[PDB]
């Protein structure tokens, strides 16, 4: 499996640019695409898993882990006290859980379990962070590398301060690879902290049922239309490819052919 380093302390609007453009690259299925948007893989493919190196301005990392098929963060690592120390959610299987531990910490006599008792759900990590709603959660550029570094190599922290760093990271990395909006929210807000707006939450609650709705769409329209929200929360009713795919960065698998084009 390979590693994604992206500088979060010496970022730039093109230096993240190019980490979006890298792990799209890598993550991607290297031939699946509908209407020139790239699909990832079945559940299957090897690797199975991409790591992402987050680096504050101290030059302390930590690496998440993410399942390849869907993006989604299974845990992540950092060094403390010359120990790889392994943070695993407490939703995935055992034999997935075993294959977190290798990815991450390779060296089984140098790493060391510090858990994340808690599910990835948006609702379990917004209760964990003391919100009502991630709209509530700042992100930005600044906030990342603060919070890497309430974490990496520190003895002990609060589950409100992982669940925060959690919430930051799998929207301004997973999502931001899922959607070119949040990925461009970012980059239009760089210099700066911005709310995820109701678009934001929207695109992020309905990747599965959009990339189902561009693989089915035939001659660009879709089959039955689909509801999402604007950024000034009016309805969305998503119509054609061409209404949505400017947002897209990745489809979520889906099987059988479609339009590649």
């Not at 970022?11 to 980490?19: E, G, R």
């Not at 934001?200 to 709705?213: D, F, R, Y």
Request: charged content about 20%; overall charge positive; hydrophobic content about 35%.
């Amino acid at each position: 499996v390979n590693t994604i380093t992206f500088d979060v302390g010496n970022a730039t609007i093109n230096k993240y640019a190019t980490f979006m453009e890298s792990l799209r690259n890598e993550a991607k299925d290297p031939t699946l695409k509908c209407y020139g948007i790239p699909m990832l893989p079945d559940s299957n493919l090897t690797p199975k898993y991409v790591l992402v190196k987050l680096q504050d301005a101290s030059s302390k990392t930590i690496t998440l882990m993410l399942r390849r098929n869907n993006l989604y963060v299974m845990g992540y690592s950092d060094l403390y006290n010359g120990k790889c120390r392994y943070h695993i959610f407490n939703d995935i299987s055992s034999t997935e859980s075993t294959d977190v531990e290798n990815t991450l910490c390779p060296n089984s006599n140098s790493r060391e379990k510090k858990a994340i008792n808690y599910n990835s759900q948006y609702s379990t990590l917004q209760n964990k962070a003391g919100v009502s709603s991630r709209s509530q959660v700042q992100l930005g550029i600044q906030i990342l590398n603060s919070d890497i570094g309430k974490i990496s190599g520190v003895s002990t922290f609060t589950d409100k301060t992982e669940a925060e760093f959690l919430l930051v990271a799998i929207q301004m990395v997973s999502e931001a690879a899922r959607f070119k909006y949040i990925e461009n929210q970012v980059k239009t807000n760089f210099n700066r902290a911005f709310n995820p707006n109701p678009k934001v939450l929207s695109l992020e609650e309905n990747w599965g049922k959009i990339s189902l709705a561009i693989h089915n769409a035939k001659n660009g329209a879709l089959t039955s239309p689909l509801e999402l929200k604007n950024a000034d929360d009016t309805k969305w009713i998503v119509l054609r490819v061409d209404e949505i795919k400017p947002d897209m960065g990745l489809l979520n698998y889906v099987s059988g052919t479609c339009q590649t084009t």
